[PDB]
Design a binder for these strands. Structure first.
Lengths: 151, 129, 149, 186, 82
RNA sequence: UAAAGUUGCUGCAGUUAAAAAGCUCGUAGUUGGAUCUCUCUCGGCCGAAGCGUUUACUUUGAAAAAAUUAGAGUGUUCAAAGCAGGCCGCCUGGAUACCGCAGCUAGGAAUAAUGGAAUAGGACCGCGGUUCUAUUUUGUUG
């Protein structure tokens, strides 16, 4: 697919893609190295990140974002922006006078890289905290676990 | 519909013991009911009981020895820490000399004194005295 | 009590304690399976197949002879119906009530009973969607549900 | 023939296999024992001086073994005189999964592989000619459980003398004390 | 009154109860082998049958469904099993 | 504020004293029957890994201003206080506990939720097929 759907050229800023080509420099292939990094904390770089072609500067694996801070989990509830999803974290808040709990939830707008295709509503996502990416986004989707019902 | 089969079992035992009956039938049986009954029996409060095995959900015939004043359930199963145990004992037990609060802890189902011996907390199932 | 009635009836089957095949019963498990296949090919629901096997062939319980339930056998052979028979009969009853109500518009009792039937239909359909027995997009609409019948 | 699941045959196992091969070669039921097999065998004391021979059988063959178990047990009792013989299917118990189980489970443990189901099946198979018609687990004041099993009235005196070895075998391979009795109301 | 006790017999107090309310539930029905005088083979029929069953070698009405126990035709000798 | 169990979570009431919707259905909310008991470099089966099934709960360990409250010592002449002081240069204190919820951590695995194998694109096992594969050339790479 064409990765150049923007008014400006999309590229990985750390990759030089027009190193000089000559007869010896080209033998039936142009070649294009792919910048990717191994984020920490045991998270493995998805295969599509390594062998993909998308340009996403907020992607944890091939972009310019450092995963540091809280590592949370949520359930995907809305996928209707570009490269951003809304997940819902459900918890119980303890009211002490009644010695009981009440259901509460918080929505979280988190960045989803193009490396995670086939993400559905109800999927569980492990997200990691990064620097502010937009007005409301501060977490990047690190891992996707499909909801029970995969067959 | 019926929730909390242990509540039904304890209410049945209480109602039968208040009428002065020698045995009480409990249905359905469950592991929690059997453990609570075993705790009651180890302290001499009920006596022997028989688990009738039908292929759906067993029944229990509990022999009553009239030493039981009240066996009750605590719903919901509040989580109880070792600090809150004294307050629960003051609330539920008629005296500091006798009576037991039954908890389900990770070490099993046990009275409150045994939970203090093992230095564990858990969830309150009920009480008997 | 009943889900949609003040009735508190107790009438139901009482399975015997023994789970063994009766001594009188000489049909092999495969024989019961072929009888089930024949009855299903005749166009019968699993409840009807079980009733016929109990009444005529002496099969007290198919699960105890074949080690499998009738609907599971029908599915495994590949001739189980598209939607479960309880939901099918609920939809059929709803269709009958709607057909009656079309020509009898002053029957408020029929409208009330239709409301009850469709509530039962929706509850069963939600349960089936939870179990992935029905597709998640399946919905009971009262416009062409007679085709589902 | 004896084929232990861990391929570890024993001298008693060898003698029982030789006896079964003897019934294989010439008997009224020689057509069945050729294709059949036992996983193991062992003896145990049951109390006093009596002895019990637990013949461990693969599960798929148990039903077939139960087709002809009466004559086989009769002939094997005759060959060993006063040691009773009981056929039990070889069943494995998958341990209850935990949060620390290193590597023992990759699929859901079937309920038929659980300890409760295996022990129920052992009790069912240990008493084969007589069908169980009821169970009562009485919990004694010391906390120990005694199982009382009610057996069918169709076959009572044929296995009444067996009520002693049955409890011994169950104690040996299950650890639970059990009493076998016959009810008067069917 | 001293349940499940052998000292005081109660076959009569147990089969009097509702089938579901017994100590261990058990059906009040049975299967019966039926001979038809015109026929020559067994037919195993449920006591509370809901189907008009016919002889497996003929077209004779063995029994008819009723509110409860099915009604057998005359002359057909029926004997309970077990 | 207690008394007020007259706001009732503990712990209230609702036939007649104030009070149960005219009656059903019904989404959210709340609540839900039984059931499953020996694996990475080692010079101590003898340092280690989890790559495997998640939480709630409970216990523990970190981290958590002081002042206040609780609380140890100390004759302010006593006490409220203070953090002093004591002995014939010396001796000694300026403790300790609690710090809820959320976050972090490590044991337990009853209780409660949750998960896999059912068109087997299931577990283990050996076979048929693909790669610069940080060297499989002390020799100038080929």
């Amino acid at each position: 697919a064409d990765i150049q759907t923007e008014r400006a050229y999309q590229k990985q800023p750390t990759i030089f893609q027009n190193k000089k080509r000559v007869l010896l420099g080209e033998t039936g292939k142009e070649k294009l190295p792919r910048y990717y990094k191994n984020i920490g904390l045991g998270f493995k770089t998805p295969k599509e990140a390594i062998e993909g072609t998308y340009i996403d500067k907020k992607c944890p694996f091939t972009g310019n974002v450092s995963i540091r801070g809280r590592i949370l989990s949520g359930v995907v509830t809305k996928m209707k922006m570009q490269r951003t999803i809304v997940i819902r974290r459900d918890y119980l808040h303890y009211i002490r006078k009644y010695n009981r709990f009440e259901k509460r939830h918080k929505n979280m707008s988190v960045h989803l890289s193009p490396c995670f295709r086939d993400v559905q509503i109800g999927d569980i996502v492990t997200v990691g905290e990064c620097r502010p990416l937009s007005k409301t986004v501060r977490f990047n989707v690190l891992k996707v676990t499909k909801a029970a019902g995969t067959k | 519909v019926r929730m909390n089969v242990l509540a039904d079992a304890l209410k049945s035992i209480n109602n039968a013991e208040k009428r002065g009956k020698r045995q009480v039938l409990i249905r359905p049986c469950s592991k929690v009911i059997v453990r609570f009954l075993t705790v009651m029996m180890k302290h001499g409060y009920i006596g022997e009981f028989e688990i009738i095995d039908d292929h759906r959900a067993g029944k229990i015939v509990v022999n009553l020895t009239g030493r039981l004043n009240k066996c009750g359930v605590i719903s919901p199963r509040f989580d109880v820490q070792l600090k809150d145990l004294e307050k629960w004992q003051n609330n539920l037990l008629p005296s500091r000399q006798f009576g037991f609060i039954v908890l389900t802890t990770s070490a099993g189902i046990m009275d409150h004194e045994e939970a203090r011996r093992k230095h564990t907390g858990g969830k309150i199932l009920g009480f008997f005295f | 009590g009943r889900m949609h009635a003040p009735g508190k009836g107790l009438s139901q089957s009482a399975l015997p304690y023994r789970r063994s095949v009766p001594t009188w019963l000489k049909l092999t498990s495969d024989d019961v399976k072929e009888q089930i296949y024949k009855l299903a090919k005749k166009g019968l629901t699993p409840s009807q197949i079980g009733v016929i096997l109990r009444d005529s062939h002496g099969v007290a319980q198919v699960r105890f002879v074949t080690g499998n339930k009738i609907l599971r056998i029908l599915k495994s052979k590949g001739l189980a119906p598209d939607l479960p028979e309880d939901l099918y009969h609920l939809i059929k009853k709803a269709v009958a009530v709607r057909k009656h109500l079309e020509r009898n518009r002053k029957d408020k009792d029929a409208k009330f009973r239709l409301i009850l039937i469709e509530s039962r239909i929706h509850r069963l359909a939600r349960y089936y969607k939870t179990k992935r027995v029905l597709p998640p997009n399946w919905k009971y609409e009262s416009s062409t549900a007679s085709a589902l019948v | 023939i004896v084929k232990p699941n861990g391929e570890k045959p024993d001298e008693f196992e060898s003698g029982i296999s030789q006896a079964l091969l003897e019934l294989e070669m010439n008997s009224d039921l020689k057509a069945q024992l050729r294709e059949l097999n036992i996983t193991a065998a062992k003896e145990i004391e049951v109390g006093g001086g009596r002895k019990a021979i637990i013949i461990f059988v693969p599960v798929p063959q148990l039903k077939s073994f139960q087709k002809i178990q009466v004559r086989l047990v009769r002939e094997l009792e005759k060959k060993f005189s006063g040691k009773h013989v009981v056929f039990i299917a070889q069943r494995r118990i998958l341990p209850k999964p935990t949060r620390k189980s290193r590597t023992k489970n990759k699929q859901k443990r079937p309920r038929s592989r659980t300890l409760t189901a295996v022990h129920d099946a052992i009790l069912e198979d240990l008493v084969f000619p007589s069908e169980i018609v009821g169970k009562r687990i009485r919990v004694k004041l010391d906390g120990s459980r005694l199982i009382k099993v009610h057996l069918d009235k169709a076959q009572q005196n044929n296995v009444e003398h067996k009520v002693e070895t049955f409890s011994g075998v169950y104690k040996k391979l299950t650890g639970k004390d059990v009493n076998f009795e016959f009810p008067e109301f069917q | 009154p001293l349940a499940k006790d052998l000292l005081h017999p109660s076959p009569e107090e147990e089969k009097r109860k509702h089938k579901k309310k017994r100590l261990v539930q058990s059906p009040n029905s049975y299967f019966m082998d039926v001979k038809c005088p015109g026929c020559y083979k067994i037919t195993t029929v449920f006591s509370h049958a809901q189907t008009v069953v016919l002889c497996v070698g003929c077209s004779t009405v063995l029994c008819q469904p009723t509110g409860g126990k099915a009604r057998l035709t005359e002359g057909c000798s029926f004997r309970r099993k077990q």
